[PDB]
Write a protein that binds this ligand. Sequence first.
Ligand SMILES: *[C@@H]1O[C@H](CO)[C@@H](O[C@@H]2O[C@H](CO)[C@@H](O[C@@H]3O[C@H](CO[C@H]4O[C@H](CO[C@H]5O[C@H](CO)[C@@H](O)[C@H](O)[C@@H]5O[C@H]5O[C@H](CO)[C@@H](O)[C@H](O)[C@@H]5O)[C@@H](O)[C@H](O[C@H]5O[C@H](CO)[C@@H](O)[C@H](O)[C@@H]5O)[C@@H]4O)[C@@H](O)[C@H](O[C@H]4O[C@H](CO)[C@@H](O)[C@H](O)[C@@H]4O[C@H]4O[C@H](CO)[C@@H](O)[C@H](O)[C@@H]4O[C@H]4O[C@H](CO)[C@@H](O)[C@H](O)[C@@H]4O)[C@@H]3O)[C@H](O)[C@H]2NC(C)=O)[C@H](O)[C@H]1NC(C)=O
Ligand SMILES: *[C@@H]1O[C@H](CO)[C@@H](O[C@@H]2O[C@H](CO)[C@@H](O[C@@H]3O[C@H](CO[C@H]4O[C@H](CO[C@H]5O[C@H](CO)[C@@H](O)[C@H](O)[C@@H]5O[C@H]5O[C@H](CO)[C@@H](O)[C@H](O)[C@@H]5O)[C@@H](O)[C@H](O[C@H]5O[C@H](CO)[C@@H](O)[C@H](O)[C@@H]5O)[C@@H]4O)[C@@H](O)[C@H](O[C@H]4O[C@H](CO)[C@@H](O)[C@H](O)[C@@H]4O[C@H]4O[C@H](CO)[C@@H](O)[C@H](O)[C@@H]4O[C@H]4O[C@H](CO)[C@@H](O)[C@H](O)[C@@H]4O)[C@@H]3O)[C@H](O)[C@H]2NC(C)=O)[C@H](O)[C@H]1NC(C)=O
Ligand SMILES: *[C@@H]1O[C@H](CO)[C@@H](O[C@@H]2O[C@H](CO)[C@@H](O[C@@H]3O[C@H](CO[C@H]4O[C@H](CO)[C@@H](O)[C@H](O[C@H]5O[C@H](CO)[C@@H](O)[C@H](O)[C@@H]5O)[C@@H]4O)[C@@H](O)[C@H](O[C@H]4O[C@H](CO)[C@@H](O)[C@H](O)[C@@H]4O)[C@@H]3O)[C@H](O)[C@H]2NC(C)=O)[C@H](O)[C@H]1NC(C)=O
Ligand SMILES: *[C@@H]1O[C@H](CO)[C@@H](O[C@@H]2O[C@H](CO)[C@@H](O[C@@H]3O[C@H](CO[C@H]4O[C@H](CO)[C@@H](O)[C@H](O[C@H]5O[C@H](CO)[C@@H](O)[C@H](O)[C@@H]5O)[C@@H]4O)[C@@H](O)[C@H](O[C@H]4O[C@H](CO)[C@@H](O)[C@H](O)[C@@H]4O)[C@@H]3O)[C@H](O)[C@H]2NC(C)=O)[C@H](O)[C@H]1NC(C)=O
Ligand code: 9WZ
Ligand code: 9WZ
Ligand code: 9OK
Ligand code: 9OK
Ligand code: NAG
Ligand code: NAG
Ligand code: NAG
Ligand code: NAG
Ligand code: NAG
Ligand code: NAG
Ligand code: NAG
Ligand code: NAG
Ligand code: NAG
Ligand code: NAG
Ligand code: NAG
Ligand code: 975
Ligand code: 975
Lengths: 624, 624
Amino acid sequence: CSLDQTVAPGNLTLCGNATLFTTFRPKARFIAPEGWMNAPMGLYQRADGSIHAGYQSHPKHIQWGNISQGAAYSSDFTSWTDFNGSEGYKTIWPSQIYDIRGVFDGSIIKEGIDGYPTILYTSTSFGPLGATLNEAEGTETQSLAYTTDDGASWIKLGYGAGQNPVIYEWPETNLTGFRDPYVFQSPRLEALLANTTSITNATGDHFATISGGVHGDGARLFLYRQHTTGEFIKWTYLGPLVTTGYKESYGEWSGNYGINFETAGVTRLNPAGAAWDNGSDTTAVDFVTFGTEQGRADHQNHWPLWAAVDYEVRDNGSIEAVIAYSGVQDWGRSYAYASFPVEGYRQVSVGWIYEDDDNVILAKQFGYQGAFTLFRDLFVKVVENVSPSTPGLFEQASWSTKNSTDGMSVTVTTLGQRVVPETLAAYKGNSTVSTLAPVMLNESAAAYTPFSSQPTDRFYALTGSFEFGLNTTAKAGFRVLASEEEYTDIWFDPASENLTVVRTASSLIKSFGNDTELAKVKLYEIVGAESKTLNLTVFVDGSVIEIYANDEVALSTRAYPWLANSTGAGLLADGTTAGDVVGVSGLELWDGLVDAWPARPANTSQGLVWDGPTAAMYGLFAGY
Amino acid sequence: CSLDQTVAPGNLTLCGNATLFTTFRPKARFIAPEGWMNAPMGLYQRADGSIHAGYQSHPKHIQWGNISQGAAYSSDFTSWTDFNGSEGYKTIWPSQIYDIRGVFDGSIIKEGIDGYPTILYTSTSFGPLGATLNEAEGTETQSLAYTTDDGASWIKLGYGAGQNPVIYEWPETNLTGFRDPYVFQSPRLEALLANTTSITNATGDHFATISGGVHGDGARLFLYRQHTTGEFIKWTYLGPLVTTGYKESYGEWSGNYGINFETAGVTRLNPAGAAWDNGSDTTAVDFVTFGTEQGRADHQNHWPLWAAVDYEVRDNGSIEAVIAYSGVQDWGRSYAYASFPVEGYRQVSVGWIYEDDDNVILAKQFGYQGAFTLFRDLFVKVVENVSPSTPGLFEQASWSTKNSTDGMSVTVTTLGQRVVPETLAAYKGNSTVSTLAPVMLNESAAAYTPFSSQPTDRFYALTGSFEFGLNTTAKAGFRVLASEEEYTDIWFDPASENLTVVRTASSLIKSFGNDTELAKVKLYEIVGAESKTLNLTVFVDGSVIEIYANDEVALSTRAYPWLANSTGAGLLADGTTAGDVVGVSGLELWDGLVDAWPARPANTSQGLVWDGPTAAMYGLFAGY
Ligand SMILES: *[C@@H]1O[C@H](CO)[C@@H](O[C@@H]2O[C@H](CO)[C@@H](O[C@@H]3O[C@H](CO[C@H]4O[C@H](CO[C@H]5O[C@H](CO)[C@@H](O)[C@H](O)[C@@H]5O[C@H]5O[C@H](CO)[C@@H](O)[C@H](O)[C@@H]5O)[C@@H](O)[C@H](O[C@H]5O[C@H](CO)[C@@H](O)[C@H](O)[C@@H]5O)[C@@H]4O)[C@@H](O)[C@H](O[C@H]4O[C@H](CO)[C@@H](O)[C@H](O)[C@@H]4O[C@H]4O[C@H](CO)[C@@H](O)[C@H](O)[C@@H]4O[C@H]4O[C@H](CO)[C@@H](O)[C@H](O)[C@@H]4O)[C@@H]3O)[C@H](O)[C@H]2NC(C)=O)[C@H](O)[C@H]1NC(C)=O
Ligand SMILES: *[C@@H]1O[C@H](CO)[C@@H](O[C@@H]2O[C@H](CO)[C@@H](O[C@@H]3O[C@H](CO[C@H]4O[C@H](CO[C@H]5O[C@H](CO)[C@@H](O)[C@H](O)[C@@H]5O[C@H]5O[C@H](CO)[C@@H](O)[C@H](O)[C@@H]5O)[C@@H](O)[C@H](O[C@H]5O[C@H](CO)[C@@H](O)[C@H](O)[C@@H]5O)[C@@H]4O)[C@@H](O)[C@H](O[C@H]4O[C@H](CO)[C@@H](O)[C@H](O)[C@@H]4O[C@H]4O[C@H](CO)[C@@H](O)[C@H](O)[C@@H]4O[C@H]4O[C@H](CO)[C@@H](O)[C@H](O)[C@@H]4O)[C@@H]3O)[C@H](O)[C@H]2NC(C)=O)[C@H](O)[C@H]1NC(C)=O
Ligand SMILES: *[C@@H]1O[C@H](CO)[C@@H](O[C@@H]2O[C@H](CO)[C@@H](O[C@@H]3O[C@H](CO[C@H]4O[C@H](CO)[C@@H](O)[C@H](O[C@H]5O[C@H](CO)[C@@H](O)[C@H](O)[C@@H]5O)[C@@H]4O)[C@@H](O)[C@H](O[C@H]4O[C@H](CO)[C@@H](O)[C@H](O)[C@@H]4O)[C@@H]3O)[C@H](O)[C@H]2NC(C)=O)[C@H](O)[C@H]1NC(C)=O
Ligand SMILES: *[C@@H]1O[C@H](CO)[C@@H](O[C@@H]2O[C@H](CO)[C@@H](O[C@@H]3O[C@H](CO[C@H]4O[C@H](CO)[C@@H](O)[C@H](O[C@H]5O[C@H](CO)[C@@H](O)[C@H](O)[C@@H]5O)[C@@H]4O)[C@@H](O)[C@H](O[C@H]4O[C@H](CO)[C@@H](O)[C@H](O)[C@@H]4O)[C@@H]3O)[C@H](O)[C@H]2NC(C)=O)[C@H](O)[C@H]1NC(C)=O
Ligand SMILES: OCCc1ccc(O[C@]2(CO)O[C@H](CO)[C@@H](O)[C@@H]2O)c(O)c1
Ligand SMILES: OCCc1ccc(O[C@]2(CO)O[C@H](CO)[C@@H](O)[C@@H]2O)c(O)c1
Ligand SMILES: OC[C@H]1O[C@@](CO)(OCCc2ccc(O)c(O)c2)[C@@H](O)[C@@H]1O
Ligand SMILES: OC[C@H]1O[C@@](CO)(OCCc2ccc(O)c(O)c2)[C@@H](O)[C@@H]1O
Ligand SMILES: *[C@@H]1O[C@H](CO)[C@@H](O)[C@H](O)[C@H]1NC(C)=O
Ligand SMILES: *[C@@H]1O[C@H](CO)[C@@H](O)[C@H](O)[C@H]1NC(C)=O
Ligand SMILES: *[C@@H]1O[C@H](CO)[C@@H](O)[C@H](O)[C@H]1NC(C)=O
Ligand SMILES: *[C@@H]1O[C@H](CO)[C@@H](O)[C@H](O)[C@H]1NC(C)=O
Ligand SMILES: *[C@@H]1O[C@H](CO)[C@@H](O)[C@H](O)[C@H]1NC(C)=O
Ligand SMILES: *[C@@H]1O[C@H](CO)[C@@H](O)[C@H](O)[C@H]1NC(C)=O
Ligand SMILES: *[C@@H]1O[C@H](CO)[C@@H](O)[C@H](O)[C@H]1NC(C)=O
Ligand SMILES: *[C@@H]1O[C@H](CO)[C@@H](O)[C@H](O)[C@H]1NC(C)=O
Ligand SMILES: *[C@@H]1O[C@H](CO)[C@@H](O)[C@H](O)[C@H]1NC(C)=O
Ligand SMILES: *[C@@H]1O[C@H](CO)[C@@H](O)[C@H](O)[C@H]1NC(C)=O
Ligand SMILES: *[C@@H]1O[C@H](CO)[C@@H](O)[C@H](O)[C@H]1NC(C)=O
Ligand SMILES: OCCc1ccc(O)c(O)c1
Ligand SMILES: OCCc1ccc(O)c(O)c1
């Protein structure tokens, strides 16, 4: 095992455990100290204003198992500190018959048991577990724990009748899944159900959704309501909130609804952020965010989706969320988005970016797997004065359209996503910022033009505004993590409406994934404009490439170039001519970003362990 | 619910939980503070000379489940003190994937991990578990924990490769069971195997047996040897120590070997107690004690047995224990005998006496189930100068015979059992002792003759020596827990060699068992004697009746008379005449015994709880 990054990589499978720990590792984002991580969980803003973030964690292993809550906190979403207790950075772990198979995803009741922050989580026990298996009742239940020390530790309710688990009966037979309880308050749903509370007797101020589906018949999001305010044991099943068909797709802009939901949440937004009105705010929109499984050929069969919904009240005192329009939260290698309320009328969302090493070839050599996305403010994106000649505008696929009185302009509404401003300010202020001169890409443009200032390492951000002619057939974008021999190309092609990440040359190491990423982006053309504009921002963070377009489209992916000098960046141009010109302006490079874990040393590996021959006997976890 | 014990019992199933807690409860023996108990476990003499006793425990329930080690200690086997920690009187409980289904029976390595007392125990996980089910590998494994505070708490080794569980591979396929590891030192087995240690590489000073069997092919006791002295992770399977046939019986004196062994142990005894020689002591005998299942029509299909064995060394460096003669450790409602070494060359044995409420009719009303037997010294019982005309003497069924040179007398050898002298001394010294006049039972004997002094409550001991003619057809014995309307009759019938306990009138409460208990007793006739003698001792302790005959035969059973005055005792006589006389002498009543738990109040119930609907979903425990 040579770690010489000035020559071609050897056979890196001969390298020892965690010998590649720092090589490709993100530094500017949320990531576990070591080992396996997946979904964010237990997210809440604490009483002191700081953010508590949990995550599905399996320390000292590089595959999933014994899944536990790891945790950390931050005053600004950006610089983090690990909890450190009797179980290291873990704060909840399998310990009881009802959760011994795994402490799955859960969410926070901020004023819960005895007034303390309380987590409702999926407690898993023995038996087949999965949407393509014959799962039985009891294997996935929902349980409570509360914290008296602001998340340093959690105390579970006792096992038994009238205690944990608190939700265990399946609401319908033959479920594909029954997990990821999302607890939320909703003046909107309270107002809608107020006339029906005699029917169900559920009058509490908290709601909870549970994610799943029905065998052969598509995904389901099940709605529960807390039975009585101030009491947390009894949750009354109302009915299915979202019902979709077996591998139903709303279309090209909307992924696929698969066979089963995971990590679903419910929110209400307006143009400024979170909306806490009862329906009276006409600018507010109800949204559901959700993962789907087995509706995709790649990306581990997973889509992270969202839908704008219109609520209808059923005669039995339940709510049907009718999908109005439907989109994608991130088009790349990310999943398990969780959102939570933040002071100042914000709803903040964060997901999990998985690696691109599906065959587990270098996972032990890394000594870790997984990271978070950046934290994102959600809001209703509104585009005014949209030209009706915008191609495809009235499909209304992942957006709504509203005509002006005279029919000559349109107001477009969709889900907005942007990186939280605390992170952008910290990144910029800690970086070496280079403000670059605008560039016209014409007949003289090379295929690749390096920026006049270059990154110094694999931790940087780029931004640029690309102005295209309305009938362009040119392509443009950014190349990142680039040397002569390795590079990753981010292209936008307005004629096809496709944002792609081409990774055929991303790395000399052939075991990592090299498939092309794709997102659809609609450039809403403005009345009177003779051009259309793509604002593209890219974060490069170790192996993470996280792309944002027009505060709307997100695409997270991975690139693992071997060579030490594969860090460069610049502009891409294809089919630009004297007549078909792409104007690039607002160009800026931020080199360095932020050290997101200042108390951590560079190498926080504690080694890896094997569970031994019993792992295969129990059959629950891979064991490593 | 009336608790008026001066009138007939009502419908006692209407009584609340633990309302009958003190009514039938033993006071003079080892018993849990409340709830379910079964097998003794983790027995050892601590460094200060006190005795540590563990037991299978399920607090606040009256059926088995979440099975844990409850524990207590005593300086004299007789007066006990509960441990009290974070889990009350529990000291080991299900907590890890490998033991979450139950912390089953285990035994003590006195100088174990880091020099501390260490328990090797059966750690159980998910799946079918039982001799009549299709159990798989992993469901029962063997794990270590050690104590740094003399049994107040135990620390388990970590889960994983080279740690817990330490024994998990099945030594043969299709096992009926794989549990109850019994760890022991044996100069005898070391000496026998010394010439074969090149074959196996196992040279440690501890051995361990694991109890089980093979589907369709009878029970097995598997022998392991510690691989290396001072190291406790690696245990090398040598081979089957005891192999018996599917429901094989050695005969009427020997119970039945069933289909599977439980709680088996290995010891070496001589006439004084424990023998620690290497084979050089010609008076010493190797014994195996073991439970068998599914070889009995009643008594919950369980026999607690023992066998004298002769060890043979196999060519592969293992030991075959060849059964020389085979007997019964207790003929009544007891099981799960554990034995352990005690200073002064003693081996002490103790078992579990179950209730006689198989249909679970009044278990909740009790608020507890189960107790221990008394603690018993084991030794080789030797009877000299036995007459060869003793009927059946040369069947050698549960004994051996050795002729004198002249063939006119015989030395009989068998397993001896007697109550530990510490308990007998404490019982007698704390009791009101009545020494009774000898009685000849002849033509004038009533069927029942009360003793001249009577017990004052349900806590007493009796003793008597019954002298019979060599061709008697008379019967005699003791009646206990007796009023006019309720009584329990203990008879010996020398013509049939049957000691019986007739329980047809034991209680007015009809839900308790009333079947007749039976033990075989051989009266070894002495050369020149014109009579044969039965020394019979009976302990009455709440509902326990525990009978000992000739320091050899033990029979534990239950009687639950309702009436407050059903406490009397006296002599029984049947078919005694002027010519067929039974002489009774050495008669003594000890009224009161000892309060075995002086720190406990009378009612130590903490109520009962239900596990809720998930108990049936998981399917592992009854849930109450
Ligand atoms: C199989 O058997 C298993 C083992 O028995 C069993 O698991 C056990 O289940 C029981 C029963 O559910 C659990 O008991 C509960 O424990 C809760 C506390 O849990 C936390 O703390 C304990 C104890 O912590 C001490 O000890 C440890 C270990 O040494 C130390 O690390 C600690 O520092 C601490 O040490 C101090 O105290 C020691 C003695 O206790 C001293 O020795 C020492 O010197 C120190 O001073 C921990 O062990 C727990 O850890 C475990 O669990 C966590 C998850 O929770 C895991 O992460 C971890 O790995 C461990 O597994 C944990 O940290 C108690 O709160 C709880 O008691 C409440 O509930 C019951 C009702 O069920 C009531 O009877 C009781 O009165 C309590 O309720 C009151 O309190 C709260 C307020 O605090 C109220 O919400 C409630 O309404 C009520 O209020 C009352 O009082 C109010 C105020 O006065 C009043 O106003 C009200 O009106 C009202 O009257 C209960 O005891 C036990 O933790 C489990 N143990 C383990 C190891 O798992 C398992 O379930 C069984 N399985 C099956 C299938 O049956
Ligand atoms: C799924 O995830 C689960 C959760 O992660 C996981 O379970 C956990 O597994 C890990 C790994 O196996 C366990 O970690 C071990 O813990 C042992 C100690 O266990 C006891 O103590 C802990 C901690 O107790 C503190 O905290 C609790 C809780 O607050 C308090 O109640 C205590 O009072 C105590 O508090 C003090 O300390 C705190 C911080 O630690 C402070 O906050 C506080 O202020 C106090 O000061 C308890 O939690 C344990 O309870 C649990 O387990 C018991 C059963 O054991 C249950 O009954 C109970 O209900 C709980 O479930 C328990 O009481 C450690 O000894 C052990 O560390 C040794 O082993 C590892 C090797 O594996 C070494 O890395 C390490 O160095 C240690 O080895 C050395 O030490 C011993 C000597 O002591 C030697 O034998 C050994 O050779 C070695 O010696 C070294 O040092 C020598 C001297 O210097 C030197 O000479 C030698 O040469 C050598 O170098 C390890 O940390 C963890 O307990 C589990 N936790 C739980 C909750 O279950 C589960 O396995 C996972 N499942 C799967 C399927 O993967
Ligand atoms: C005395 O001790 C017992 C523990 O043994 C305490 O708890 C009770 O245990 C018994 C089992 O011994 C439970 O009986 C079972 O009940 C279920 C149905 O229960 C439902 O209906 C009840 C009647 O109103 C109700 O009390 C229950 O409410 C509890 O449970 C829910 C969770 O489901 C929880 O949310 C509540 O807060 C309560 O904790 C519940 O709604 C029944 O299906 C079982 O039937 C089987 O067994 C019986 C007997 O053989 C048989 O007849 C059936 O055919 C079937 O085989 C079983 O009857 C009882 O529910 C428990 N009660 C509780 C927890 O309140 C009991 O509390 C102790 N008493 C006191 C005064 O302390
Ligand atoms: C690096 O990190 C790993 C954790 O990932 C550390 O532990 C090793 O993990 C790997 C899995 O990643 C284990 O590989 C498996 O090994 C078994 C066979 O193991 C046996 O033979 C080994 C070779 O000598 C030996 O080391 C093992 O000894 C350990 O385990 C026993 C208990 O069985 C215990 O008593 C000992 O004390 C040791 O702890 C053992 O005897 C093999 O069956 C597995 O095969 C599967 O997977 C591979 C890979 O896909 C495949 O090729 C097979 O076809 C099959 O699919 C697997 O190879 C390895 O055994 C673990 N080694 C240990 C625990 O020592 C590792 O230690 C870390 N290294 C360092 C230097 O820290
Ligand atoms: O829910 C997202 C799907 C997903 C994606 C990758 C996984 O992750 C990787 C990425 O290459 O694939 C491997 C699993 O085959 C895993 O070792 C690795 O971390 C995974 O466990 C779930
Ligand atoms: O291993 C001894 C067999 C045995 C005997 C009785 C049991 O015990 C009793 C006694 O009536 O039977 C009942 C089980 O049906 C149990 O509630 C009760 O304690 C038991 O669980 C195992
Ligand atoms: O770590 C768990 C969290 O990860 C999520 C989101 O990816 O997916 C469940 C993944 C999963 C794990 C084990 C299985 O047997 C299975 O079929 C699917 C959540 O649904 C969940 O709470
Ligand atoms: O509490 C356990 C201890 O009790 C013993 C002795 O009676 O028997 C096992 C009883 C048993 C429990 C659960 C089962 O599924 C089963 O088939 C038998 C031991 O073998 C053991 O360690
Ligand atoms: C980068 O490193 C490679 C390999 O060491 C070298 O060939 C190349 O000239 C370097 N510089 C580049 C590609 O700009
Ligand atoms: C790389 O090394 C592995 C052993 O880890 C070996 O199996 C594989 O064939 C090697 N690949 C080569 C030499 O290309
Ligand atoms: C309410 O009605 C809906 C629509 O038929 C149904 O799916 C749901 O199960 C009902 N809720 C109940 C029975 O609680
Ligand atoms: C909206 O405007 C477009 C363009 O003028 C027109 O084709 C369409 O019919 C209008 N829709 C409505 C509902 O008026
Ligand atoms: C650098 O980042 C830190 C950590 O997020 C932040 O608090 C600080 O304000 C930043 N420095 C600037 C903007 O100068
Ligand atoms: C015992 O009590 C019963 C019922 O109260 C009574 O009939 C009887 O006379 C009493 N004394 C006896 C049986 O010696
Ligand atoms: C005793 O009470 C139970 C209720 O616990 C009842 O079912 C049974 O029939 C009663 N037996 C009688 C009255 O004999
Ligand atoms: C014993 O105590 C328990 C628990 O407090 C109580 O429910 C029960 O009625 C008591 N029984 C007696 C006989 O005092
Ligand atoms: C040793 O031989 C015996 C007798 O055939 C056999 O039962 C046992 O399994 C053998 N031991 C091994 C293979 O370790
Ligand atoms: C033992 O003694 C009996 C009675 O004298 C006799 O029948 C038997 O043959 C003797 N056995 C041996 C082995 O000498
Ligand atoms: C009474 O019993 C106690 C407890 O076992 C014992 O220590 C004491 O010696 C006994 N009293 C006597 C024999 O007088
Ligand atoms: O096909 C869209 C035709 C059209 C309708 C109204 C407009 O204002 C427009 O610019 C184009
Ligand atoms: O049947 C036993 C005959 C017998 C042999 C030797 C004796 O010493 C005896 O008393 C009887």
